[PDB]
């Protein structure tokens, strides 16, 4: 009956996926009615379309690489670099090991930066997936930096949805990520005076990056606007709040004033490395503003 009417709307011609799994059908059933299910089905269909297109492109490139590899075999010119090599080609491993050493040094002496995962109740499933993806990108950008932050994952419930998704996404790397993940709040780990909670709705405007201050970023993705939530949370603890200067330096044009976690961490990393506000704000999406105010 259930998959029967799903096949009925398939016959209707609506864009729907094929060979769907059980968890996806459960999620679809979780939807209220009509438009929610239609959006979810269109998503899944587009996901399958992209997956199959990537499969076709990958097979094409594999065949092209095979034939081109035989062609390159035809040369047999030899005398390649005289075999005068100082290092073996193990560069990805060495980069990972160097990043690990730098992460250990940062965990011991790095400046704290907190992501507070206390919004799971303000986020839908899709927003949760987006938040996890942006958290991965932010952590990756932090690792590569010449002077990484010491990243804290505060208020991260062990069995919560966000922690579950992070564990699923990171696999065994989760236990080896060079960062501090804890259920306690940022107020239980650092003095209340050193904490600055970054929000877009704060009356105060950030002027300079401070190296003795602990910046708190709300790991929140609200494509359904909920202004003042991070500000309200910071007010309960009575924490100082700051907002990025975007009206001062950029002609905002059309867009939303709340950036993503990855953009936020990149801006903060640029500022921490003695970058100016122009260089730091180069990470703001160009489609939003029109230029840097002169």
């Amino acid at each position: 009956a259930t998959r029967e009417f799903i096949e009925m709307w398939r016959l209707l011609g609506r864009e729907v996926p094929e060979h769907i799994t059980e968890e996806e059908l459960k999620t679809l059933m979780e939807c209220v009615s009509n438009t929610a299910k239609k959006k979810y089905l269109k998503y899944l269909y587009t996901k399958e379309k992209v997956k199959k297109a990537r499969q076709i492109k990958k097979e094409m490139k594999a065949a092209a690489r095979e034939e081109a590899k035989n062609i390159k075999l035809l040369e047999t010119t030899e005398e390649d670099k005289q075999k005068n090599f100082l290092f073996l080609r193990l560069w990805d491993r060495n980069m990972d090991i160097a990043m690990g050493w730098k992460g250990a040094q940062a965990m011991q002496f790095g400046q704290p930066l907190v992501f507070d995962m206390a919004y799971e109740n303000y986020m839908k499933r899709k927003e949760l997936q987006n938040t996890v993806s942006q958290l991965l990108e932010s952590e990756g950008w932090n690792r590569r930096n010449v002077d990484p932050f010491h990243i804290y994952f505060c208020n991260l419930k062990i069995d919560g949805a966000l922690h579950r998704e992070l564990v699923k996404r990171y696999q065994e790397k989760w236990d080896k990520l060079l960062l501090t993940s804890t259920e306690k709040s940022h107020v239980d780990l650092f003095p209340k005076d050193s904490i600055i909670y970054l929000t877009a709705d704060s009356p105060n405007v950030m002027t300079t990056f401070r190296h003795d201050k602990v910046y708190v970023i709300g790991s929140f993705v609200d494509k359904s606007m909920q202004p003042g939530t991070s500000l309200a949370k910071a007010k309960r603890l009575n924490l100082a709040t700051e907002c990025l200067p975007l009206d001062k330096y950029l002609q905002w044009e059309i867009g939303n004033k709340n950036l993503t976690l990855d953009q936020m961490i990149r801006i903060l990393l640029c500022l921490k490395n003695n970058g100016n506000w122009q260089e730091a704000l180069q990470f703001v999406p160009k489609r939003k503003h029109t230029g840097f105010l002169e």
Partner: protein, 692 residues
């Protein structure tokens, strides 16, 4: 051409004696309003109701209480840019439309059509409206929804293997939608087989019944009998706008019972109790904390006893009451206003420096000495609204009342909806308060400053009925233009001038010359009624036919009101050493050029005149939306500064206390203070960009 989607009905006005009997309907295609009445503009603005696509405006009776507010609605539509609008009612509305011209202002790019009762039908294929006349004259409207038979059955097309995915199938839809039977899949399929049972459209009737003289005729109506019992188009609901006494008539009750359980019988009348402005109640309740009598609680309508339990259901109407008709017919009472004073009090309390400032003010007042000279409470001055333009939620069109004595009251700036504020401010005593009125003053000739003049008069008669006093033509002072257009309204639409007496403002000017002995007698009676000694009128240089007034009593206190004007020496001479001054304050300093262009002064000019006036105290009034909630504060301002707010009560003894209230005011406006800061930043950016 298409079919109507979900449609909604809404009760804009709860039906109270103040700004009642307003109905609204909206669908995707378009939206309509019934009995715009008076003051519904502010009500719609507050509740975020969309005014666009309001092509048609409807009504039930010619009474000003049902048609008084048309001017504001049409002006708002003109501002929006809607090019066309039409009205439905008795043919005399045409003349009434002409009347509006005399104070319409610049009207262009807008069409003002009319839909007389003689018109057969309106149609538009979206919603149909029926016109039904009444006589002892009232008109009721029956609205029938358009047919939406378009439907297709599920999975039987697949069983029939229809050639889907092609274009030639699209015409075939009409064949099944129109009612054609065709042979497909070896079946002589009929259109009804593949079509959901068509619904012609729900019907609903709107009617107003002033009294039994209109209860009796309605039953002897063929149109009503058509929809009574086994109606061709069953009626989903009926809305009645009549008092409780009319609602309990034996004939009326029988007529209501005729339809049976099929109907729902929504009703609207004075007995309904609700709040028409959450923001106003919230702000006045918050202000009440600072001091009781300056900011008295706004008494809310509260019916003592619910209406008698009639056999048929009686769904009492409420503000924001919502009823969906399609695709489901139900009472969607989801966003109905609620009264939670405690929530407002706690929300205000959870503000920075607010409670602390209030406590500090309490300490200062307690330690402060008692008022010297034991100044008498009377006279009192109550500011109902201080708005300068189309009323907003925060404020209202300029209007003030001065109670000289418990039996003598005068009114200034009788703007739009003033009776609404009178009701909201004086609950049931409104009868005594209205009887207390001796005369009403008119400011410079302008619609905003005299929009609500007619309604007041009508209500007075009702109050006179409550008290039973003999008829007393209320006095009013104004230019001859007011007399002319009021006479036109009297002799065309609704007879009201017999309840009024008029006095030219020029005859009251300093050194004026009596025009007629009757004028002299009228002005002498005016002076005697309120125990006043001198009433002075002076010209003001902001527009033609503009007057500023001054009151001097036997006790010697001199109070001067100016309204729209600019610093004038004659004003200082007239109000030299005046006890109090109430002056307009539209824009802020630094914008002198646009102040001159609009002929309105700013704060700096207000202080300049006040120190020129040499008056004991100065009050600000006539503000604009740009000052959404807060007036400018600065130590450079003298202690005499006074900022008005809705339903603000003041007396002479309060003069040494107004400046002491400056902090707590700004304490409550923290968010609005931030708004002012952002506005000032924007103004600075604009000014520097212009300079460079």
């Amino acid at each position: 051409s298409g079919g109507p989607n979900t449609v909604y009905l809404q009760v804009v006005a709860a039906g109270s004696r103040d700004s009642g009997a307003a109905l609204y309907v909206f669908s995707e295609f378009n939206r309509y309003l019934f009995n715009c009445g008076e003051g519904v503009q502010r009500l719609m603005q507050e509740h975020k109701l969309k005014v666009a696509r309001l092509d048609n405006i409807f009504l039930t009776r010619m009474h000003w209480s049902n048609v008084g507010g048309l001017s504001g609605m049409i002006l708002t539509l003109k501002e929006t840019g809607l090019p066309k609008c039409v009205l439905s009612g008795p043919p005399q509305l045409e003349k009434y439309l002409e009347a509006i011209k005399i104070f319409s202002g610049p009207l262009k790019g807008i069409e003002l059509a009319v839909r007389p009762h003689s018109a057969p039908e309106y149609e538009d294929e979206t919603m149909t409206v029926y016109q039904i006349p009444i006589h002892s004259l009232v008109v009721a409207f029956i609205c029938k929804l358009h047919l939406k038979r378009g439907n297709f059955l599920v999975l039987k097309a697949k069983e029939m293997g229809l050639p889907v995915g092609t274009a030639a199938i699209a015409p075939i839809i009409a064949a099944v939608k129109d009612g054609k039977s065709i042979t497909h899949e070896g079946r002589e399929i009929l259109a009804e087989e593949l079509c959901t049972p068509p619904d012609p459209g729900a019907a609903f009737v709107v009617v107003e019944c002033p009294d039994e003289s209109f209860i009796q005729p309605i039953c002897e109506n063929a149109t009503f009998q058509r929809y009574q019992g086994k109606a061709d188009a069953p009626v989903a609901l009926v809305v009645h706008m009549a008092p409780a006494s009319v609602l309990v008539d034996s004939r009326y009750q029988q007529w209501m019972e005729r339809f049976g359980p099929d109907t729902q019988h929504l009703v609207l009348n004075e007995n309904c109790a609700s709040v028409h402005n959450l923001r106003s109640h919230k702000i006045q309740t918050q202000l009440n904390l600072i001091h009781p009598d300056i900011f008295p609680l706004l008494t809310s309508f509260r019916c003592k006893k619910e209406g008698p339990t009639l056999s048929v259901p009686m769904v009492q109407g409420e503000c924001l009451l919502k009823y969906q008709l399609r695709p489901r017919r139900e009472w969607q009472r989801d966003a109905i206003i609620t009264c939670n004073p405690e929530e407002f009090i706690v929300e205000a309390l959870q503000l920075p420096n607010f409670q602390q400032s209030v406590q500090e003010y309490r300490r200062s007042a307690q330690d402060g000495p008692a008022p010297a000279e034991k100044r008498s409470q009377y006279p009192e001055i109550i500011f109902l609204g201080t708005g300068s333009a189309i009323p907003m939620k925060i404020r209202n069109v300029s209007a003030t009342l001065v109670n000289i004595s418990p039996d003598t009251s005068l009114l200034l700036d009788c703007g739009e909806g003033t009776f609404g504020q009178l009701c909201r401010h004086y609950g049931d005593q409104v009868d005594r308060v209205l009887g207390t009125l001796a005369a009403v003053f008119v400011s410079h000739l302008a619609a905003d400053h005299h929009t609500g003049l007619p309604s007041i008069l009508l209500q007075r008669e009702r109050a006179l009925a409550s008290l039973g006093k003999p008829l007393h033509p209320l006095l009013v002072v104004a230019p001859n233009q007011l007399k002319a257009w009021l006479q036109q309204y009297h002799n065309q639409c609704q007879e009201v001038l017999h309840h009024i007496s008029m006095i030219p403002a020029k005859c009251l000017q300093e050194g004026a010359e009596i025009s007629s002995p009757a004028v002299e007698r009228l002005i002498s009676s005016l002076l005697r009624t309120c125990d006043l000694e001198e009433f002075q009128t002076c010209l003001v240089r902001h527009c033609k036919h503009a007057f500023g007034c001054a009151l001097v009593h036997t006790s010697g206190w001199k109070v001067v009101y100016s309204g729209d004007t600019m610093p004038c020496e004659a004003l200082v001479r007239m109000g030299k050493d005046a006890t109090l001054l109430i002056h307009e304050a539209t824009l802020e300093d630094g914008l002198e050029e646009e102040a001159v262009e609009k002929t309105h002064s700013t704060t700096s000019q207000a202080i300049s005149v006040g120190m020129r006036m040499n008056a004991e105290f100065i009050m600000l009034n006539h503000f604009s939306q740009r000052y959404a909630k807060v007036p400018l504060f600065s130590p450079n301002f003298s202690e005499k500064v006074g900022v008005a707010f809705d339903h603000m009560k003041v007396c002479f003894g309060d003069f040494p206390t107004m400046p002491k209230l400056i902090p707590p005011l700004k304490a409550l406006f923290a968010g609005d203070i931030e708004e002012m800061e952002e506005r000032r930043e924007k103004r600075e950016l604009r000014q520097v960009r212009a300079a460079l």
